[PDB]
Design an enzyme around this catalytic site. Structure first.
Site, short mmCIF file in Angstrom:
data_model
loop_
_atom_site.label_atom_id
_atom_site.label_comp_id
_atom_site.label_asym_id
_atom_site.label_seq_id
_atom_site.Cartn_x
_atom_site.Cartn_y
_atom_site.Cartn_z
CG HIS A 40 -0.72 -0.02 2.48
ND1 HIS A 40 -0.69 -1.18 3.25
CD2 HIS A 40 -0.35 0.99 3.31
CE1 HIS A 40 -0.33 -0.87 4.48
NE2 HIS A 40 -0.13 0.43 4.56
N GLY A 142 1.56 6.28 9.87
CA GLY A 142 2.99 6.14 9.50
C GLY A 142 3.66 4.94 10.09
CB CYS A 144 1.98 0.94 7.45
SG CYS A 144 1.99 2.64 6.79
#
Ligand SMILES: *[C@@H](C(=O)N(CCC(N)=O)NC(=O)[C@H](Cc1ccccc1)NC(=O)[C@H](CC(C)C)NC(=O)OCc1ccccc1)[C@H](O)C(=O)OCC
Ligand SMILES: *[C@@H](C(=O)N(CCC(N)=O)NC(=O)[C@H](Cc1ccccc1)NC(=O)[C@H](CC(C)C)NC(=O)OCc1ccccc1)[C@H](O)C(=O)OCC
EC number: 3.4.19.12
Lengths: 299, 299
Positions: A40, A142, A144
């Site tokens: 993503h 943030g 991830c």
């Protein structure tokens, strides 16, 4: 003197990079000459709903991926997908690559999480895979790309990469092969997590930790059958214990001299008649985030 | 003399009913005064794609559900949903209700399936939950509502209810609480099953079955570490064996006198150097649908 502890995080710290596509930056894991990161990273704002990842990926150039280890860019020279992860081939082998394995973890098993923003580590905490395949983390926008891991002697076992935050504020992610834990998908569509339950096998382990640490008051005054234990416990939203789990408690049962079904019986009375105003290891509440393996480790 | 065997099916046979809504008829399970059945009994042809089940259900009258045990209607006097199942409250308690439990099964565990059409049993077969949360069954249109089960001494443990056939021709279903095994949903939308793997713990168990039955030729000529076994086996698309699985083989290792890692070593050589033109229990191919528990049972 019994605390959640994290693994020392140094070996995983020197694998953390930042990966940016367009205006979006998240964390990646650098091992040998590959960076792993959530696919993503490639999404823009207007299609987080139904991203066609293989189409978005195929039209992307190596150069679009800006990968940085500290201040230092690592040129991406390959990219491919692996399930919900990207594998980016880079310039340079991580001179800090430790001994490592990728493992897929089971509900109930704990790992340490190294929480990161912009490739930089902020903190480490210990947690568990919940019976409903989510994790109760502490993560902000943030986060991830942050990784979960265990370490044995000299080998880092990577088990988790952070992808999503659920509506209830719990968390969802993949193994290092990009495969989700739980029925979740990496898109911002309406989903649903299962009702969670208490990790029974773990609460018992923590009652064994209490005995080892000298806490004995709650030892059982009545006897129980496995089945009769389950009938009561389920009512308190505890996972069924199977004979396989019973077998898992053998070594702590052997080291403490308390038969596993005697502890099952203590647990039943605790739930029913309870601590009500009492503590075990200084805790109100029965702790369910320590495995039999963690107890044996820290004791 | 070692065969797939099913549990005797009589106790589950007298729980089987038919449930019809409109023109759609499937199987239900009658226990006490409840009929369990897949909630897709309520769907018409033009909305199997995105059925709003709670809306379809709430507008349905008790009378719309025609439930039959043989020739004999059982009046429905309540209906509700439980996850992907309906619970219908009926007229009459099943005078044939056996002792039973509802259990959620793990990948690798086997059960018998009683295949039914129009509430009538056609056949019983033994199978397994695959590592990818599907089952390799034999089911035709109208099979939905068929149940999987195990039986111990005198208690039927229901573990499976049939819902779907995948594009690859394997099968997906729920536990008896209506919860899917695997990341699947009960609607005819594009989905995806995980790549399947071989049930390692089971192939070992079946090699122990061979030894017990007198088959010894493939006993190991070289030694192995757990880790070194896994490195080879994964390459053959076998599941990793963990120490927990190792522990599961203890009793068969004790009864045969063959250390579990010695059998892991035999398996490695079998895969590599193989039977090539040889048989084990009369079988080419390594069988992975018998659990350690099944071997001990049938031996
Ligand atoms: C990446 C990031 O930091 N995080 C986690 C932040 C946190 N608090 O943990 N990841 C995201 O924010 C997800 C980004 C994304 C993933 C795939 C496709 C598109 C975007 N998004 C979510 O986690 C999102 C949060 C919203 C506030 C709801 N989650 C869901 O949509 O939940 C789905 C769901 C699950 C279960 C039940 C119901 C619903 C950072 O956001 C980033 O860099 O994004 C790049 C796109
Ligand atoms: C019910 C029935 O007998 N069966 C199984 C038949 C069999 N061969 O096993 N169930 C069905 O046919 C499903 C019916 C249904 C379920 C929910 C909502 C609407 C309908 N349908 C399917 O199994 C369908 C088969 C088609 C040929 C593809 N499966 C899928 O759509 O697959 C989804 C998928 C999974 C994984 C990867 C990709 C895709 C009998 O059909 C009945 O009575 O139906 C009432 C609606």
């Amino acid at each position: 003197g019994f605390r959640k502890m994290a693994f020392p995080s140094g070996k995983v710290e020197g694998c953390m990079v930042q990966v940016t596509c367009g205006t979006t930056t998240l964390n990646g894991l650098w091992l040998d000459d590959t960076v792993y990161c959530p696919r993503h990273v490639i999404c823009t704002a207007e299609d987080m709903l139904n991203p066609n990842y293989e189409d978005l990926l195929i039209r992307k150039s190596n150069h679009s991926f800006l990968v940085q280890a500290g201040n230092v860019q690592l040129r991406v020279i390959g990219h491919s997908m692996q399930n919900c992860l990207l594998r980016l081939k880079v310039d340079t082998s991580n001179p800090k690559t430790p001994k490592y394995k990728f493992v897929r973890i089971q509900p109930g098993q704990t790992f340490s999480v190294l929480a990161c923003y912009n490739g930089s580590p902020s903190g480490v905490y210990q947690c568990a895979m919940r019976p409903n395949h989510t994790i109760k983390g502490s993560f902000l926008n943030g986060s991830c790309g942050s990784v979960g891991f265990n370490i044995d002697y000299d080998c880092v076992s990577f088990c988790y990469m952070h992808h999503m935050e659920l509506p209830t504020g719990v968390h969802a992610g993949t193994d290092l092969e990009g495969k989700f834990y739980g029925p979740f998908v990496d898109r911002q569509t309406a989903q649903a997590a299962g009702t969670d339950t208490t990790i029974t096998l773990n609460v018992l382990a923590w009652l064994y930790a209490a005995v080892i640490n000298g806490d004995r008051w709650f030892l059982n005054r009545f006897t129980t059958t496995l089945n009769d234990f389950n009938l009561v416990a389920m009512k308190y939203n505890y996972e069924p214990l199977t004979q396989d789990h019973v077998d898992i408690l053998g070594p702590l049962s052997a080291q403490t001299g308390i038969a596993v079904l005697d502890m099952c019986a203590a647990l039943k009375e605790l739930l029913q008649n309870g601590m009500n105003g009492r503590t075990i290891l200084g805790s109100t509440i029965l702790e369910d985030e320590f495995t039999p393996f963690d107890v044996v480790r820290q004791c």
